[PDB]
Ligand binder design. Structure first.
Ligand SMILES: C[S@@+](CC[C@H](N)C(=O)[O-])C[C@H]1O[C@@H](n2cnc3c(N)ncnc32)[C@H](O)[C@@H]1O
Ligand SMILES: O=[N+]([O-])c1cc(O)c(O)c([N+](=O)[O-])c1
Ligand SMILES: [Mg+2]
Length: 212
């Protein structure tokens, strides 16, 4: 019985099926008052809602699914016919992402890619019928932000106007990535100060728009 298993257990009991918003509040109050978990949280989540609602992307890439909290959060706001792909290396996390997604009724617009982001990014175009990504949400291991950004650029998955949204830019921090995107003339950057999930600590989301 793992931590990620009780969180699905909570949703399966307290959340009402087919309602993406409900699941969200289930995951939030469980982690909020029983066990801490590396979900984006509601407070930066409300920012991703504002950012997704604005740029209204057709194809969106997530790096690191975990329990599907952010996959639910993003995909419940996608226009009809929009796709979200979510890369997750851990088979156990990837099995629970799917369940969570099924419960929310969001299984039809979210495609799970089970594997290491570095291995599947070069295979993204061909295997999954992908031209360019309208938006990338980075939230996997922090050492992989920069590598995978150059990897996404290399494979030509980055389009002029692509929105990279990066989590945990203050805590635990993604300093090499932050340094590259803010300094690069390929990226136009905005910071949104928020708060680390389930805590009174200052975190924030960095938005970086590729320019070519
Ligand atoms: C911060 S959690 C993701 C949280 C999720 N996006 C949310 O906010 O609800 C990090 C997850 O990314 C996965 N991960 C770490 N490195 C990865 C990689 N290189 N490729 C794909 N997934 C990775 C880990 O298994 C872990 O579950
Ligand atoms: O432990 N943490 O402070 C976090 C928080 C987070 O929001 C994370 O995404 C994380 N991680 O990617 O492993 C770690
Ligand atoms: Mg995070």
């Amino acid at each position: 019985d793992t931590k990620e298993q009780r969180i699905l257990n909570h949703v399966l009991q307290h959340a009402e099926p087919g309602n993406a918003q409900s699941v969200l509040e289930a995951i939030d109050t469980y982690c909020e008052q029983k066990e801490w978990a590396m979900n984006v949280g509601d407070k930066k989540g409300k920012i991703v809602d504002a950012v997704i609602q604005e740029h209204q992307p057709s194809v969106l890439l997530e790096l690191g699914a975990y329990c599907g909290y952010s996959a639910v959060r993003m995909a419940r706001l996608l226009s009809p016919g929009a796709r979200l792909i979510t890369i997750e290396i851990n088979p156990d996390c990837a099995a629970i992402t799917q369940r969570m997604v099924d419960f929310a009724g969001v299984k039809d617009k979210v495609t799970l890619v089970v594997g290491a982001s570095q291995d599947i990014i070069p295979q993204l175009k061909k295997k999954y019928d992908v031209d360019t990504l309208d938006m990338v949400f980075l939230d996997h291991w922090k050492d992989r932000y920069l590598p995978d950004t150059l990897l996404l650029e290399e494979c030509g998955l980055l389009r002029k106007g692509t929105v990279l949204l990066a989590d945990n830019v203050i805590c635990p921090g993604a300093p090499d990535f932050l340094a590259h995107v803010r300094g690069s003339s390929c990226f136009e950057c905005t910071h949104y100060q928020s708060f680390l999930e389930y805590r009174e600590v200052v975190d924030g989301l960095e938005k970086a728009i590729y320019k070519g």
